[PDB]
From a paper:
We determined structures of intact ATP synthase from Bacillus PS3 in three rotational states by cryo-EM. Three conformations corresponding to different rotational states of the enzyme were identified by ab-initio 3D classification and refined to high resolution. The 3D classes contain 45, 35, and 20% of particle images and the overall resolutions of the corresponding cryo-EM maps were 3.0, 3.0, and 3.2 Å, respectively. As expected, the most striking difference between the three rotational states of the Bacillus PS3 structure is the angular position of the rotor (subunits γεc10). The structure of the ATP synthase, with three αβ pairs in the F1 region and 10 c-subunits in the FO region, results in symmetry mismatch between the 120° steps of the F1 motor and 36° steps of the FO motor. By comparing the positions of equivalent c-subunits in different rotational states, the observed rotational step sizes in the three rotational states of the ATP synthase appear to be almost exactly 3, 4 and 3 c-subunits. Bacillus PS3 ATP synthase is found in a conformation that has been proposed to allow ATP synthesis while ATP hydrolysis is auto-inhibited. In this state, subunit ε maintains an up conformation and inserts into the αDPβDP interface, forcing βDP to adopt an open conformation (lower, dashed box). In contrast, all three non-catalytic sites in the cryo-EM map are occupied by Mg-ATP, while a Mg-ADP molecule and a weak density tentatively assigned to phosphate are found in the βTP site and by the p-loop of βE, respectively. The cryo-EM maps show that a clash between subunit ε and βTP blocks the central rotor turning in the direction of ATP hydrolysis while it is still free to turn in the direction of ATP synthesis, which could explain the ability of subunit ε to selectively inhibit ATP hydrolysis.
Author numbering:
A (entry chain a): 6 to 131, 152 to 191, 198 to 234
B (entry chain H): 4 to 67
C (entry chain G): 58 to 228
D (entry chain c1), F (entry chain c2), G (entry chain c3), H (entry chain c4), I (entry chain c5), J (entry chain c0), ...: 2 to 72
E (entry chain b1): 7 to 56
Write the structure that this text describes.
């Protein structure tokens, strides 16, 4: 399970998982936003429910006039992190090489650069103790999502090997239901703490 | 020392009883002399005056 | 009056969007200037400072005040009548708990009492006593600290309606 | 040889801290909904928010314990 | 080929089967509650106009 | 050599964390049902949810203890 | 060698966790039965299932200490 | 060689757990009989079944520390 | 050679557990004294039997510590 | 060799301290928004600055843990 | 040999237990004086005999620490 | 050569103490702003000077850990 | 040699126990003179004798740490 | 040799005890000035003499840590 990199500069498998999660998020977004309907049904009501959910979170943290801009960053951020956490659970394939296609959030560099991208955005829209608190909250957000996905990934993998090598269906079943629970809770706390620091720096 | 049960209509039962065990809305209570100043809203139940050798039940509605 | 205690809605004065009125008249006539003085002072204090029928609500006690405010087309939201000559506590208790619970819904935001104060047999002074919020309060020249058995808040939630009912029954 | 019990004390102290923090949070949530049932959805919401926040920093100790077992 | 892949994918499928017997009744009722709520909200306005 | 000691202190600190957290949440739910007895099913269901969410990290400590024992 | 020290530290930490957790549960349920003594069977069944959880995770801790002593 | 230190940490941690548990139980029952004085026999019977209930696992930890001292 | 360390930590953990348990029971039995004076004999009898309960295991610990030092 | 165990106790004690601190803060803000639910933002911002403090000292501890690991 | 740190860890755990127990009981005597300052003699005499009870087992531990240091 | 273990236990115990102290202070101050809001600035300043004290002793602990690892 | 470790440990656990006990006694006397300020001198003087009582034995541990450092 | 981690366990346990006791004192003084604000200078002066009284013994633990490190 080594870091398989075709190029010396960057991990190849992480780029593959970023591309596949971007395409699956984009196609579920355009499948939920096919046509305009004033009476919501099907999946457009689901997309509007996620949209008003993100909006509600923004309304909890800040005034609606200040935080109205962030709604379309926040909904793609929660859906992106949501699908990025749930991709690691079904397949997690092992090839004759090092490793291929685990999940993007299990990579520490992916989650830490997504967290520092979040904080770069909330510095863009917006004394040593304040800046060390800033670097502290960046790295604890990135390490939060990275750890709480990567431990479950390793455990699921361990369970998979224990089952295949030699009766053990329900422990990994209970853990895998708990892991999609961890995925949706981590996506929600990630976008909510994103909006908290956005509200803290805007107003 | 002594208990005094009053009503807006008029006082009902004033005696010399050293033990009362009226039920408050949190739960049971027990009062002997030398007790701390304590305040309890009483539930709709009976107060037990059991210090004169035999118990004496007195009901409260509203209650305090 | 001790350890704060102003967190309850019946101590602190909320902003005023309405005003309740508890008017105490008689069921029967042949009293000379009893009902005339009470209903005149209530009509003056209502028409002086509101100028809108939606900004007040009136709770009458007595058929004379009820007929007064139905001749003058005013709301008589709580309207019990037919009291005995020496009234007990239960018949005023049910309208008193309805009055306090109608304050606690956020409707009245304050209310007043209007009644004739019996001094000695010939005057019968008209009083305007503010029922609640309980801002006007005074300690009994010496105080002992209390232990609150559930908490302070539940004791206030039980006690302050009973104090309002006792004020209403005394008036 | 020493990295094994290094990883073990790391995951053990993480489990201890997360257990105490989760116990404090969840116990206060259920006594709060015992005080009144009308706010149990918002108290369960902030319950899971709190459980994530106290189970977050021990699991970075867990994955760092795996790093310690790696070296 | 590895053995873990089809094993955990098969139990993910049977977990979705258990979650289908357990879970299609709540969230479809939540979506139907939202749909009926917004239809009654839409409906009142059209009636109010008429 | 050190793997069995590692395994044992890992499962022991997991047991300590789960015991303290479960003791807190169960104690507050029984004083909650002692305060208002008509809230017993809601209180004990949220209590079992709390048992799961305080014993999340000790249970993973147990299987990582088996990893530590295996090495 | 280290296996007996492992078994004993597992039993010791499980005993300490069970002691603190069950002490919290039993203490709050006897003060709850001191408040409202008509709720004796409900409080006793809930303290028994809570104690069953708080004991039963150190129970598997103790049998894991037995298989640590065997190794 | 390490079996005596094993039995020592086992008996010591079981003693600390039993001490905190019995302290919680007897402390809350002494404030409980301080509140309602006529509930003393029910509170004492539930207190003693709680004390035996919380020292159940420390005494079996002691009698397992004996065979830890042997092995 | 480590029997002296074994006996010493057994006595120390017994003293720490006995100190916490006696601190809890004496502390809120004097709270019970301070709330009402008239129940001083029954509060003190339940106090001293609680002292016996929280000290008994500790006493066993120090006797077994002398057995451990003899080993 | 011992730098691995040094980094491990550093991250473990930091995780334990951050877990207990975050558990206390979020516990009492649960009961704060349960007593007075209209004070949710003024409780929430002070909650998050407390979380920032009680994590930020174990965060610089776990930042130092890697230079403990290297040596 | 290591009997010196044996004696010292006995002194240290006895000091920790005596400190926590004495802190609890004298703190709640202050709380009881604050509730009712006219029973200061009976509160202080029950305080000092509780201090004797909490202090007794660490003093026994420290004289055994003297017998442990020599060996 | 044990200076890395020295500095790491120093940073870890300082982080644990600062975490528990900051958790207590921040938790009671959000309860203070929860029971009454109108002097949140009065509460916050004394909260921050308490945080300053309970971290300023582990800050000099961390600096002393730096000069421990230097030796 | 290892007597330095002995003395430091005694000093450290004496400081920890004295810190927790002094924190309890001073914190509860803050609450005590906060609720009834007209009583302040008598309860702060019995607070000071409680302070001397809770830190009597850690000073004895400091003296014994001088003895252990001498050995 | 081991004097550096002797110095460090002294500083670490002193910092942990100072953190817990100081957190208790500051938390009770802010809830005291929260429930009645007019006694802020009195409560802060007795809080500062209390925290000086607590951290008196960890500071002499730090200078004893200095003479342990010099050893």
């Amino acid at each position: 399970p080594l870091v398989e990199f075709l190029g010396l500069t960057f991990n190849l498998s992480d780029m593959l998982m970023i591309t596949i999660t971007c395409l699956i998020v984009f196609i579920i977004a355009v499948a939920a936003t096919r046509s305009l309907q004033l009476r919501p049904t099907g999946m457009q009501n689901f997309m509007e429910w996620v949209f008003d959910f993100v909006r509600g979170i923004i309304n909890s943290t800040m005034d609606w006039q200040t935080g109205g801009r962030f709604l379309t960053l926040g909904v793609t951020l929660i859906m992106y992190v949501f699908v990025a956490n749930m991709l690691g659970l079904p397949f997690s394939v092992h090839v004759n090489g090092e490793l291929w296609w685990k999940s993007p959030t299990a990579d520490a560099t992916v989650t830490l650069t997504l967290a520092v991208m979040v904080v770069a955005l909330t510095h863009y829209y917006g004394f040593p103790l304040k800046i060390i608190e800033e670097f502290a909250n960046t790295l604890t957000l990135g390490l939060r999502l990275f750890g709480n996905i990567y431990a479950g990934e390793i455990l699921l993998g361990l369970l998979a090997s224990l089952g295949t090598h030699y009766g053990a269906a329900i422990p990994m079943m209970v853990w895998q239901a708990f892991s999609i629970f961890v995925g949706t809770i981590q996506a929600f706390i990630f976008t909510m703490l994103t909006m908290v620091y956005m509200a803290h720096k805007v107003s | 020392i002594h208990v005094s049960v009053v009503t807006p209509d008029g006082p009902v039962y004033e005696d010399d009883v050293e033990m009362v065990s009226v039920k408050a809305k949190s739960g049971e209570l027990g009062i002997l002399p030398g007790h701390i100043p304590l305040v309890a809203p009483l539930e709709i139940s009976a107060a037990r005056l059991k210090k004169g050798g035999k118990t004496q039940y007195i009901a409260v509605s509203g209650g305090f | 009056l001790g350890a704060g205690g102003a967190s309850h809605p019946m101590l602190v004065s909320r902003p005023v969007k309405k005003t309740g009125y508890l008017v105490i008249t008689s069921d029967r006539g042949l009293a000379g200037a009893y009902n005339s003085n009470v209903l005149r002072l209530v009509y003056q204090t209502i028409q002086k400072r509101h100028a809108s029928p939606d900004e007040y609500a009136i709770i009458v006690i007595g058929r004379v005040g009820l007929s007064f405010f139905r001749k003058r087309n005013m709301p008589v939201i709580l309207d019990i009548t037919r009291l005995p000559d020496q009234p007990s506590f239960a018949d005023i208790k049910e309208i008193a708990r309805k009055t306090v619970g109608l304050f606690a819904d956020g409707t009245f935001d304050e209310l007043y009492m209007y009644y004739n104060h019996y001094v000695s047999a010939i005057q019968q002074e008209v009083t305007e006593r503010k029922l609640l919020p309980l801002t006007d309060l005074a300690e009994n020249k010496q105080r002992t600290v209390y232990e609150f058995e559930p908490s302070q808040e539940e004791i206030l939630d039980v006690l302050l309606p009973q104090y309002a009912e006792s004020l209403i029954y005394g008036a | 040889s020493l990295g094994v019990l290094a990883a073990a004390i790391a995951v053990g102290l993480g489990a201890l801290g997360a257990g105490i923090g989760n116990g404090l949070i969840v116990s206060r949530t259920i006594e709060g909904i015992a005080r009144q049932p009308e706010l149990r959805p918002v108290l369960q919401t902030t319950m899971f928010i709190g459980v994530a926040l106290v189970e977050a920093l021990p699991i970075i100790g867990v994955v760092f314990s795996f790093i310690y077992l790696g070296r | 080929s590895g053995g873990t892949i089809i094993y955990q994918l098969l139990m993910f499928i049977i977990l979705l089967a258990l979650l289908r017997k357990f879970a299609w009744q709540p969230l479809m009722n939540i979506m139907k509650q939202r749909e009926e709520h917004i239809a009654n909200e839409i409906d009142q306005a059209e009636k109010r106009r008429q």
